[PDB]
Write a protein that binds this DNA or RNA. Sequence first.
DNA 1: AGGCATGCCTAGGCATGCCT
DNA 2: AGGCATGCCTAGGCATGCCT
Lengths: 199, 199, 199, 199
Amino acid sequence: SSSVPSQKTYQGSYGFRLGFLHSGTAKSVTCTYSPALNKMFCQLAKTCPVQLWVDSTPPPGTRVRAMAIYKQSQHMTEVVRRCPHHERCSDSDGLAPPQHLIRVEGNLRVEYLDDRNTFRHSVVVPYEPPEVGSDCTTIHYNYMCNSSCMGGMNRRPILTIITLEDSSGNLLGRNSFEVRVCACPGRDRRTEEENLRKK
Amino acid sequence: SSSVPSQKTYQGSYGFRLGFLHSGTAKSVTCTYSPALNKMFCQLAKTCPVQLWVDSTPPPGTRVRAMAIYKQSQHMTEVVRRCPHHERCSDSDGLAPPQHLIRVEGNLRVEYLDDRNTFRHSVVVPYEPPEVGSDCTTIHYNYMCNSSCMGGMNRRPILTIITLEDSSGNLLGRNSFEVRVCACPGRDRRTEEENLRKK
Amino acid sequence: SSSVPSQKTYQGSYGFRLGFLHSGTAKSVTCTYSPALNKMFCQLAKTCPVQLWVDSTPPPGTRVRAMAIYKQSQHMTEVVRRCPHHERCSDSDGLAPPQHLIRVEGNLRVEYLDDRNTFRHSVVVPYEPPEVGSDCTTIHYNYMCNSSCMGGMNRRPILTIITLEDSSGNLLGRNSFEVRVCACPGRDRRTEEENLRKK
Amino acid sequence: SSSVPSQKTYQGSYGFRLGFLHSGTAKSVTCTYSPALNKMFCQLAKTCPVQLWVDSTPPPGTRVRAMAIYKQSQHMTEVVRRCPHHERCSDSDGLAPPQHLIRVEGNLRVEYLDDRNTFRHSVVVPYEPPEVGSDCTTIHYNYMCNSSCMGGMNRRPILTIITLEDSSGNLLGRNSFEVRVCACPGRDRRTEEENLRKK
DNA sequence: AGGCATGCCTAGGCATGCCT
DNA sequence: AGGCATGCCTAGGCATGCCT
Ligand SMILES: [Zn+2]
Ligand SMILES: [Zn+2]
Ligand SMILES: [Zn+2]
Ligand SMILES: [Zn+2]
């Protein structure tokens, strides 16, 4: 009955884990991931590659959902949406609704969904197994507002929750990670890791 | 026949206990809990996470009720309500009556009830067992007046009484805690703990 | 066209002036007037005597009106009225609307008015000339909220505007003074006068 | 033919001048005017008193119009309006259209106009002469976005253009001043004045 | 990439009905 | 009458997109 999706890591029967690319720590790198914070730092609308790893191939018709929630207890109830400014700027690829924060690029079967009870947005693609001789598949996500956007995330941290779901909407696996969308992900990742260390 | 609900701790057959998050002692932290005082300090309308722990899962259709009473003997008879100012400020989410002090956020099955004999307000949600691999569930409560509100709590301390109730309104368990809603929960928790020590 | 009454002092052709009584400035005197601040300090609902002085007798049917406005430019446009708690206190004399800040006591011809355009409150009594060998007439006003009332004056200072008006509605004279309604008028007068002299 | 209003000062035959109130330049004063910069610094939606001074009294039916234009040549052609977040905040008084930057408060005859050719917004009140023994009349303007609002003024300076216009629409006089709507008017005024003198 | 911007987070300290 | 309460005013300093 909670309207807040769970964020609990659940590797599940198929051994579901996420993977992220080692990037530069240059000031304005487009996407970078901090293991220490379990946090992705990225620029608005740039490609954020996320690897899916499983120990065993899930059943056919399995789906991959991405949803954002505010991380802080104080904001968890609020639906993460795009700010009014970016919602009106007609940057849609034709598939993604202007209100949705998370897009998937380069997938012909993407679906953008809206929970009729919680009003929360999400973007779903079918799960595909890796090519023979590869260990993972990679989804290219895009975040369409900055963390700081007035009237949107308004500087609040979010978590992206990725779930592996069988065809019948049951939970196969869940992982999550924090996201900051910002102008200078390298600077900001360095600042946050140093702040963690300093205090 | 008493119009004052009981505050007596009753762990009961299911081992019912409350839990609270460790928070900053920063001056204006939004919510903080003092074990020495069994007292929660929080800001008006901010999220107050309350954990529910049971040794054994209660029967289905079990419900979780929250009710406020004045803590002092001198005031226990008086129904705790919102002050006239906040009652008229049209801040309702559409579900909570403007008169009710305690709200629950993020729950699709919340009910706001009113005792026909005592006129006391309460807010109820269905009990849900923890997710597999978690020990507790968490309810997000909100207190919609400061303790100091003129015409309302008027600087008097309250207790929140959480009861675990079976489908047929029988008591399964009961816990309670003091609450101060205030502008600077960190300062005020330090002051009260130090006052306890000094005298 | 402006919805804010003028406060401009206008003694007019009848020589219209206000006077105040000397009051012992004990910490909690019921009412005291500071000439240096042109400001009255009084307790909620206590008698505030205000003297009407005039060089020439006004024509029959002259009336005396009192209105409150917020003193500061930031609040001028907001109608001065009672806070929600004192509005529902059921303390009307059967004549004053429960929302009106200013009442007149001890007058068989008092009338309370609501401006249909500005929605501002005022209280009118007929002007009576002094008795032979008296120099002035006194009106007894009551202020039915503290300056600090939440949802009412909310610590903002107000002016009382006293107008002398003939039966045809012409302005014959106007005077004003600041008001603080508070628990300890003698203390508060002393504190503001001190603050005045340290500027 | 130009869609940009003229800002050219024109006191005209009635000696039309603007005046401003002396304000205390605390860090967050609500409104302050810098004569050296001819610039008002004010907080979002707070009262900005603007004095209208005139040597000869304008004819009946004279109106006072306020419009905003971007100050820099690079932005002059762009209509000044509210950002998308604030346009959708539902903060109208029931009279100002939600898109208009400039409101007039406390006037029973305000009208909000959209130019059918340029689409620029303006707000108009009737001109009222000063009361006898008064030297000027004051309008209370409000600005409903910060200069920094994303998707609105976006940190670009604007000018407020005040025109005195007869009922037939003749220009009787024109004055203007720069505006910054910001969180800390006293600070920001100090900083820009400092920057001016280091040049 | 260096460094400014500017709303906003923070703590010190005052307020003011009210307790003693 | 003395002195505490407690929401909130004040100033310092950080944020973070963006200018140079
Ligand atoms: Zn955005
Ligand atoms: Zn309240
Ligand atoms: Zn009141
Ligand atoms: Zn805006």
